[PDB]
Amino acid sequence: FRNNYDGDTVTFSPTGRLFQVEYALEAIKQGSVTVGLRSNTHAVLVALKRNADELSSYQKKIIKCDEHMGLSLAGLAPDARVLSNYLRQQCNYSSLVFNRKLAVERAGHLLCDKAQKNTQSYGGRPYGVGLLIIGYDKSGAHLLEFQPSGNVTELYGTAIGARSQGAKTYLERTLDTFIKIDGNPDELIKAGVEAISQSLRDESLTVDNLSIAIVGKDTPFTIYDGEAVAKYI
Amino acid sequence: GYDRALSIFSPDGHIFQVEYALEAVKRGTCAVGVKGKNCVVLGCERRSTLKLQDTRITPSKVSKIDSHVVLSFSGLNADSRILIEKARVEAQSHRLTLEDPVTVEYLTRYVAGVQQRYTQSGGVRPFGVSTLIAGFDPRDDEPKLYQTEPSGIYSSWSAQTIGRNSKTVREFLEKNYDRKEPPATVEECVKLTVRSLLEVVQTGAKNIEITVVKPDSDIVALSSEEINQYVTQIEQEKQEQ
Amino acid sequence: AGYDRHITIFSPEGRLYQVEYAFKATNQTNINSLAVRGKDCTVVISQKKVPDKLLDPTTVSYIFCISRTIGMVVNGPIPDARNAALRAKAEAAEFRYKYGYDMPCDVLAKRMANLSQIYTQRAYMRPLGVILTFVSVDEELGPSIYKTDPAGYYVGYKATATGPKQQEITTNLENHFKKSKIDHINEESWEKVVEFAITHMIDALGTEFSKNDLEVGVATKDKFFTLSAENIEERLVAIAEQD
Amino acid sequence: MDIILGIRVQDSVILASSKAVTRGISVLKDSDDKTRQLSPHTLMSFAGEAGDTVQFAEYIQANIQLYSIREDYELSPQAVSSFVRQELAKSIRSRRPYQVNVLIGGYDKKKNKPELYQIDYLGTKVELPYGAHGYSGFYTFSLLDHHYRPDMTTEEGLDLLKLCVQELEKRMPMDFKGVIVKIVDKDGIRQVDDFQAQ
Amino acid sequence: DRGVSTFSPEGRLFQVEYSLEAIKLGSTAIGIATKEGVVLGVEKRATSPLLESDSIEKIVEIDRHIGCAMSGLTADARSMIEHARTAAVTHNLYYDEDINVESLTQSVCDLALRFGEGASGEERLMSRPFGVALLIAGHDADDGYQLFHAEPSGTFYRYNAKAIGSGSEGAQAELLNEWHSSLTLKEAELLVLKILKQVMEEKLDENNAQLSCITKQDGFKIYDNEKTAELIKELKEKEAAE
Amino acid sequence: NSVFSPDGRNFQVEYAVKAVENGTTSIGIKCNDGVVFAVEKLITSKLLVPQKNVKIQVVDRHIGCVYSGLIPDGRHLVNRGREEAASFKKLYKTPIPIPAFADRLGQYVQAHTLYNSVRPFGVSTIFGGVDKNGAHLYMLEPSGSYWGYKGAATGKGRQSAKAELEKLVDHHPEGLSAREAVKQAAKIIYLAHEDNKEKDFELEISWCSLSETNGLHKFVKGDLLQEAIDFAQKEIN
Amino acid sequence: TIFSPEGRLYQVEYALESISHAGTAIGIMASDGIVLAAERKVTSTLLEQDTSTEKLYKLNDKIAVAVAGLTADAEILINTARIHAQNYLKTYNEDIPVEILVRRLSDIKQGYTQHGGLRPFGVSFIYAGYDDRYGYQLYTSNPSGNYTGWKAISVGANTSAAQTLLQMDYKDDMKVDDAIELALKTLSKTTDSSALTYDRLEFATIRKGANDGEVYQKIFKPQEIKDILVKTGIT
Amino acid sequence: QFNPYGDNGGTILGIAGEDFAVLAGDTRNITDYSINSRYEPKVFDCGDNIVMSANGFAADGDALVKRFKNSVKWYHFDHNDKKLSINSAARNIQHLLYGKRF
Amino acid sequence: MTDRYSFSLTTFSPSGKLGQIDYALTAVKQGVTSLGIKATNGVVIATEKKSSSPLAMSETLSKVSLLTPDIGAVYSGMGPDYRVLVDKSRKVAHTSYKRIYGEYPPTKLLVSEVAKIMQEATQSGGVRPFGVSLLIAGHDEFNGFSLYQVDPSGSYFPWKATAIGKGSVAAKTFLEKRWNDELELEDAIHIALLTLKESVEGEFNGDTIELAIIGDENPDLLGYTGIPTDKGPRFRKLTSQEINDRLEAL
């Protein structure tokens, strides 16, 4: 009943479930926490990085995709590299061929369709990474949540990774505050940093611990690490 | 085409197909290589399923790769041909483009490369062959001896053995090979090679064969009788109470 | 999980389970069909069952127009039925283009049978769970019925039937010909051949039919056409005033 | 034009090849060796198109050498030449054919005969007592028709060439800067490296 | 037992997890990054006295500014080294400069991804993951001296100090205590040698342990035995008075 | 998948159906000069931007598609649908007839039940439009099977929705109006939410009508959507 | 094509096992020729022996094979071996040396042992041939791609009994006629029939063709086996 | 026959100073004896403090500038936002051009 | 899409058997009995036309097929397999031979070609062996008349007379008793008709029996006159009528 039905993605279980896809989803559950949230003028990614040792790097979890777009990861880092690279190419195709910046919503559709093919092909595996996509385009600010199942949804804010449920709780309740933080980048970042806290038994996010990204009305997607994030701790 | 993965990891981190390839090597007849002061000597054995053979036409275990380097093997004979052919082609291709014969080390790295590649390719199994490769670099007199195994690993040896009961003969060679004083001559080097073989083979009848490689493409095989001159002078000599 | 139960390889007794199950599949729609030959026509009849009230009945069919001259009826599930229908249309058009004349009914049956034979022998292909009945008035052979199954088998028929009640309908027809001594319905109008076909369908199934319980295809020289409910009602009226 | 001569005496084959390499208005080399050893008892000489000439020769050499080591055995001159011919014959109908003419001279240890094969870029093979490629043949063929004898010594064969070279140094328009001479016999290949100032 | 790249219910790739087990069975490699250089040290670990110890290549040059120590199934590292060298030389060709250490590592980690039985990509020509971890050390103008751990997963991490191999758990704990942001190259050299001496299953001499470093000014140099033996003499002395 | 079970059925397809039965409820309603599509959208969280996670998809300019089950599978299908529509238009100049479009998806879906290397689709798809001769509504199951419908429903609340549709059909033999079917779709979606109501839902409706949209697929926005949401709310109190 | 825990090739071992049930073939090498003898598997009265071949095949004019195993698998390999000989002859204008053709066939076999996932050929060959580098040569190849040379050898059913008897009665200075006799003797004792009749046999010799200094291949006619069976005291 | 090339006129001028450089060009675009535009710029800021002009066949010029701008973009992506030095640009441009040697 | 079984479905089992080939032979065992008999001036192949319902038209089913004007085939086992083997065999007689040499292949060589096709299904990835055994009866100028049997393995052997299928054991014996190397064609037809009488359960007439001969050349079956150097095909299917006439004098 859960036995010979989780061999590959090319197999349904008698319940109607695709187990390999569910197990891929699981790699997210045990990934470091990341948060996304947006107002009407900006969108913000806050990613808590995870270290293997005290002597190590906290490994980067935010990848830039275009001047107006980028994303944060949780799960398999290499899978985030494949998908964001595909996204870079797509964004780039929209620019060269059409002189048009790619709509965040279309980037979602594109990611969805790419992930889908890997839920139906033999000798392939689902992607094992969740992604949070912020962007600013012709219809304003956008946050997207990508699931390796292919499911993409547009949100005002969200969180993925370990203990994300607490951050997503807080954001559900902070809604009408953060959605109104227009023309004020640093109060939106702060609202995001405050959100990621409700997911820490851990410790008190430190200088190397924290990574922030923002995109907005007159702000190209920029990443901040170490020194420049200290003023948010 | 077919590319189902055969060589894969087990939970303890072993690649079982590579592992069983080594078992096939330990199943094959013995080969020994020992390098001297101005030489390197290779030595093998033969089995006994039947003995109505014609030995003019049956493949010797020492193969010429180029005129200055030889390859011997333990394991599956059929597999070894494929490595020998490829090694021989590469040696010609190196001369054609570098205008220089291969160094012994380069040829080894190539053969080990081929073996490695067959450990990580869909729908192929690793070679059940481990090799000793020996000779002298062009315009050089320092002796060279190397060993490859099914995993693709290689390294140089003062002396070394592979195949069935190589456990025993490596034991011998570890006591008897002095790093300080290599077997200084061609003669005393063949001596150590026959001795190390003796306790594994039985009689040196239609089984023990020997090949000597000197610098500048000088490679000669011995005759049954010239082997017997070492057989006779060691059995009766090293017997005294 | 025995491999000879899942892919088309022989079992110890030299059997092909998937083919056997493909046959089982052909009765899934609980539909009987029958075909008969007239003097200058060929008629196919099949039960039409519309259970769901939400269905549009005019889209529920198991009869297919393959070419100007050839018609086909399928016993088996509709997805497989349509797959085989699309292919036969492709083959019939291709034949005409390459060879300069209309693909004869029997040759299409043979080609379809060979295609099915391949799924019988190759492992990655499942057989199609269908029996295809082909009908036409061949320009060389006259009224023709050729029938293929998931094994790759095909043969010509005087008449035939397919479905859950295949056996009863067959012996019913066998009996008619035994008595009439000839191998066709001696009747110059196709309307009477239809009437005959429906009549023996009624007697063998032990059921009366309304106009929406049937589906009729007729093949005449150089056309195959299906009947509407009204042309069927007029056939059902005529049988009532006699039988 | 590039002088490639070959003369087969009784116990040996003698190849003479010009030493000049000339691109355009300049003689770039006066000591080029237009020859590759295919086996201890088989020598090939070549002339033709600038690039193809040496690439083909070396490609043939590597193949014969490969065969040698694979069988611990030396192919006969006849077998070597058939290989060379087949290679050229395939080449002539490919996208860019090798434009190389060759002479193959070898000693057949099994038969104890010397053997000379002439093969042009089209893959036309023939065995001959004497041969040439290019313009040189328009002089040497008739000269050897006269002076050649089938049962000559190697030393007599070297006099016949001295005549051939002399004639070519008198009547050919271009300065081919002398010849390198090589003898293939039962012992092998050696160079008579003192033929120009002889 | 069903496929290569298949997920466990825990959401890990079976074959990747088992490749890591192979690396645990490998010979220890230790890297220490300082501000005067990066030091790489390895355990030779001969399987017999007759093995010519200096024919053991477990520290290799990638480019003049980049070096590499390995651990695990070392035969698998041949094609990664080859790929790394090509990446670095190629980069110099296209850009007339030195490849960044991070970029070089990323490229090697891309190679690591290309496993799977005809897996849906563009294309995966490789049947299994590598059975070898790499420590990549080098210098560049931008991010200075650097050390990287590259696992057969395709993931890579940057470290101040790192140990990979059989003695890695013991060695890592030791590195945590000993490492500070002021370690001099000569100190780092001694520390590598010391930590190797603790975790080697022989007595650390100049034949079964190899040191190497990369300085901006001199590039990547492997230490020859005489230079190592001096440091070994000198470690024993330094650890006698204390 | 390329495997028949001993009863003649296809067990991989059978399980695909389970995935569909497990999905959001979506419906189609044919009316006298068009079709109307509607769908239930579960509100996972307050954080979903309302109206901004569109489920209904257009094919060409005149076909609507909605589906229940594995959403990515549905999107894959529509992509194929769109290539199938462009290929037809390119060659034949005319826009694709709905029956023709039905068979194109039919054949493609059916293909994925043929080979053991592929899995079937985890969606039932409801689609239709106005072509050169009338309105057409279709439903297509994971097996490839499809038929014309007066009304169609699939998903968790398919039984209650199918019952409602049956009522309409029987009580409107003269056909329903486009304007009416929009409101009724709203009612029917509310009345399938009963069997899925642990989460909150958003209603989404599209239509294709000869008189109301010129035979083009269009979304029901603003007033007309609100009027429908009202009509549905009214007939539950 | 995969390894066992012990280091053996599963399908290869089973292929050899398959061959161990096939009709016995024997090769015996003399000073002045080679004998090939093969026994047909339990036959019938109605089986045509005239236009029949199944165990002895001509490869070129200087080389023949004896077959133990699957006939149809063997015809695949016979035909490509026939082609390899012809490519060699076309390339070099010299006949293919016996060993070289044998190495090639053995290399093809070895292929099905290392890659592709196809089953090995269920065939063993005895090669009888002549060339001017080694003269008369007898070879054996099996599904593992292994090849060895022989003075006398047997393949197929009862090779153990066969090998004992040949090892007993074979001597280096034999003439072809004694080798023919030994071949029949051995088969007489190893058969699973009552007696050895002519229609259960195939027979071939590679001789120095009496007077010419040239090499001849003789595939014995039904009558000629019946004859050679009489003068050796088997009638 | 179809000729894939044209000549859009057009002159460019680069001068390097001690701590600055200038790249200038005319703004006229022509075909044979006609003026297509009086203001069509052909000197471009490509980011990373590099200016570029590809004069001659305008279609080919544009294609090249487009690709170098993309080259700069991907250099940032692949090499941790590193500033592309002028010498490194020069070399990268040789490769762009030489890719079309034939 | 694509083929994903690129490995052999017929493999050696520990005992040395190839299972899938054996199972194909078991399939052939259930097949309707067929036979061939070789005369001094002909060959006869014959089988039963097992009908399924008398509504089926047995004449439309070809169990005895012409492969070339001089060669014919008949089978026991799986009809659909035989039908595709016939079509491949005809095509290969052309591609491998007629288009090269301007004449049809001799029997042994066409038989060899069929055998090759069957063997390849024994070894290629993703396939089962053919579940038929064939009897192929032909004549060629240099070999005269011959009869061959081809089995699922690809093995083929020549027979003076034989039978395959359901009543093969019984019929092989019946033939052994009746075959001598002096039979005229009409005698072999008679013997074949006798042997086939033992197999059939139901009716035994010209519409339940399919029977073909390879005999003399039939000029009237050629379709044209004026080239004296072909006198027509040696293959002839006996008509329903002609079978019955030999039955009354049986």
From Swiss-Prot, chain A:
Any one annotated GO CC term: proteasome core complex, alpha-subunit complex
One GO biological process from the UniProt record?
A: proteasomal ubiquitin-independent protein catabolic process
* SUPFAM superfamilies per the UniProt record, alphabetical: N-terminal nucleophile aminohydrolases (Ntn hydrolases)
- The lineage's top-level taxon is Eukaryota
The protein's location, in the record's own words, is:
Cytoplasm; Nucleus
The modified positions for Phosphoserine read S13
This protein's assembly is summarised as: The 26S proteasome consists of a 20S proteasome core and two 19S regulatory subunits. The 20S proteasome core is composed of 28 subunits that are arranged in four stacked rings, resulting in a barrel-shaped structure. The two end rings are each formed by seven alpha subunits, and the two central rings are each formed by seven beta subunits. The catalytic chamber with the active sites is on the inside of the barrel.
The UniProt similarity line reads: Belongs to the peptidase T1A family.
The miscellaneous annotation reads: Present with 7210 molecules/cell in log phase SD medium.
The job of this chain, per UniProt, is described as: The proteasome degrades poly-ubiquitinated proteins in the cytoplasm and in the nucleus. It is essential for the regulated turnover of proteins and for the removal of misfolded proteins. The proteasome is a multicatalytic proteinase complex that is characterized by its ability to cleave peptides with Arg, Phe, Tyr, Leu, and Glu adjacent to the leaving group at neutral or slightly basic pH. It has an ATP-dependent proteolytic activity.
Protein name per UniProt = Proteasome subunit alpha type-6
Curated annotation (Swiss-Prot), chain C:
Q: Kindly list the GO CC terms recorded for this protein.
A: mitochondrion; nucleus; proteasome complex; proteasome core complex, alpha-subunit complex
Location(s), subcellular: Cytoplasm; Nucleus
Q: Which UniProt keywords apply?
A: Acetylation, Cytoplasm, Isopeptide bond, Nucleus, Phosphoprotein, Proteasome, Ubl conjugation
Per the UniProt entry, what are the Gene Ontology biological process annotations, in alphabetical order?
proteasomal ubiquitin-independent protein catabolic process; proteasome-mediated ubiquitin-dependent protein catabolic process
Q: Which residues carry this modification: Phosphoserine?
A: S228
InterPro entries in the cross-refs? Ntn_hydrolases_N (IPR029055), Proteasome_alpha (IPR050115), Proteasome_alpha-type (IPR023332), Proteasome_asu_N (IPR000426), Proteasome_sua/b (IPR001353), Proteasome_subunit_alpha6 (IPR034642)
Source species, domain of life = Eukaryota
Q: Where is this cross-link: Glycyl lysine isopeptide (Lys-Gly) (interchain with G-Cter in ubiquitin)?
A: K223
Q: What CDD domains does its record include?
A: proteasome_alpha_type_6
Q: What is its main location?
A: cytoplasm
What PROSITE patterns does the record point to?
PROTEASOME_ALPHA_1, PROTEASOME_ALPHA_2
Q: Does the record carry Ligase as a key word?
A: no
Q: Name one Pfam family in it.
A: Proteasome_A_N
Q: How does it assemble?
A: The 26S proteasome consists of a 20S proteasome core and two 19S regulatory subunits. The 20S proteasome core is composed of 28 subunits that are arranged in four stacked rings, resulting in a barrel-shaped structure. The two end rings are each formed by seven alpha subunits, and the two central rings are each formed by seven beta subunits. The catalytic chamber with the active sites is on the inside of the barrel. Interacts with CIC1.
Q: What else is known?
A: Present with 15200 molecules/cell in log phase SD medium.
Q: Family membership, please give it.
A: Belongs to the peptidase T1A family.
In Swiss-Prot or TrEMBL terms, this protein is called Proteasome subunit alpha type-1
From Swiss-Prot, chain G:
Major localization listed first in the record, in broad terms: cytoplasm
Which controlled-vocabulary keywords does the entry list? Cytoplasm, Isopeptide bond, Nucleus, Proteasome, Ubl conjugation
Family matches, as Gene3D superfamilies: Glutamine Phosphoribosylpyrophosphate, subunit 1, domain 1 (3.60.20.10)
Question: Subcellular localization, per the record?
Answer: Cytoplasm; Nucleus
Q: Which SMART domains match?
A: Proteasome_A_N
Pfam family of this protein, just one? Proteasome
Recorded superkingdom: Eukaryota
Swiss-Prot/TrEMBL GO biological process terms: proteasomal ubiquitin-independent protein catabolic process; proteasome core complex assembly; proteasome-mediated ubiquitin-dependent protein catabolic process
- Is Ubl conjugation set as a keyword in this record? yes
Find the cross-link Glycyl lysine isopeptide (Lys-Gly) (interchain with G-Cter in ubiquitin).
K90, K189, K221
Which cellular component, as a GO term, is one annotated location? proteasome core complex, alpha-subunit complex
**UniProt entry tagged with the keyword ATP-binding:** no
> Of which family is this protein a member?
Belongs to the peptidase T1A family.
Q: Which PANTHER family match?
A: PROTEASOME SUBUNIT ALPHA/BETA (PTHR11599)
Q: Per its UniProt record, what NCBIfam families does this chain match? A: PRK03996.1
Q: How does it assemble?
A: The 26S proteasome consists of a 20S proteasome core and two 19S regulatory subunits. The 20S proteasome core is composed of 28 subunits that are arranged in four stacked rings, resulting in a barrel-shaped structure. The two end rings are each formed by seven alpha subunits, and the two central rings are each formed by seven beta subunits. The catalytic chamber with the active sites is on the inside of the barrel.
Protein name per Swiss-Prot or TrEMBL: Proteasome subunit alpha type-3
Name the source organism: Saccharomyces cerevisiae (strain ATCC 204508 / S288c) (Baker's yeast)
From Swiss-Prot, chain I:
**Which keywords describe this protein according to UniProt?**
Cytoplasm, Isopeptide bond, Nucleus, Proteasome, Ubl conjugation
As for subcellular location, the record says: Cytoplasm; Nucleus
Q: Which InterPro entries match?
A: Ntn_hydrolases_N, Proteasome_alpha, Proteasome_alpha-type, Proteasome_asu_N, Proteasome_sua/b
Main localization category: cytoplasm
Question: Which biological process, per GO, is one annotated for this protein?
Answer: proteasomal ubiquitin-independent protein catabolic process
Note whether Nucleus occurs among the keywords. yes
Q: Which PROSITE patterns match?
A: PROTEASOME_ALPHA_1, PROTEASOME_ALPHA_2
Query: What positions does the cross-link Glycyl lysine isopeptide (Lys-Gly) (interchain with G-Cter in ubiquitin) connect?
Result: K108
Output a single Gene Ontology CC term carried by this record: proteasome complex
Q: Its quaternary structure?
A: The 26S proteasome consists of a 20S proteasome core and two 19S regulatory subunits. The 20S proteasome core is composed of 28 subunits that are arranged in four stacked rings, resulting in a barrel-shaped structure. The two end rings are each formed by seven alpha subunits, and the two central rings are each formed by seven beta subunits. The catalytic chamber with the active sites is on the inside of the barrel.
Family that this chain belongs to = Belongs to the peptidase T1A family.
The protein's job, in short, is: The proteasome degrades poly-ubiquitinated proteins in the cytoplasm and in the nucleus. It is essential for the regulated turnover of proteins and for the removal of misfolded proteins. The proteasome is a multicatalytic proteinase complex that is characterized by its ability to cleave peptides with Arg, Phe, Tyr, Leu, and Glu adjacent to the leaving group at neutral or slightly basic pH. It has an ATP-dependent proteolytic activity.
Supply the name of the protein. Proteasome subunit alpha type-2
Q: Which gene encodes it?
A: PRE8
